[PDB]
Amino acid sequence: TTQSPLNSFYATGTAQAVQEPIDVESHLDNTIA
Amino acid sequence: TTQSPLNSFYATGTAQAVQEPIDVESHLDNTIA
Ligand SMILES: [Ca+2]
Ligand SMILES: [Ca+2]
């Protein structure tokens, strides 16, 4: 004679974010002379 | 000279319930990245 609560069910996922939106690189190779 | 009550007859059955109505299994194998 056991009474159960009937709520022992689960499901699991994951998420992440490990980088910045943009990357910037420079090529200014001229001199104001 | 014996007086009988005439109620000595019986029949027996059985019943059971040994499991929960539903079972749940998860397959969430994608990542919000
Ligand atoms: Ca970066
Ligand atoms: Ca079960």
Side-chain angles (χ1 to χ4, degrees):
Chain A
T1 306
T2 315
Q3 180 54 90
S4 169
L6 293 162
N7 54 20
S8 281
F9 311 99
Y10 287 91
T12 301
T14 47
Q16 63 165 231
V18 294
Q19 75 213 345
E20 286 179 308
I22 69 172
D23 266 320
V24 175
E25 163 182 332
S26 171
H27 275 141
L28 303 176
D29 288 312
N30 262 79
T31 311
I32 298 162
Chain B
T1 306
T2 315
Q3 180 54 90
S4 169
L6 293 162
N7 54 20
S8 281
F9 311 99
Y10 287 91
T12 301
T14 47
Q16 63 165 231
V18 294
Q19 75 213 345
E20 286 179 308
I22 69 172
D23 266 320
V24 175
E25 163 182 332
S26 171
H27 275 141
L28 303 176
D29 288 312
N30 262 79
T31 311
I32 298 162

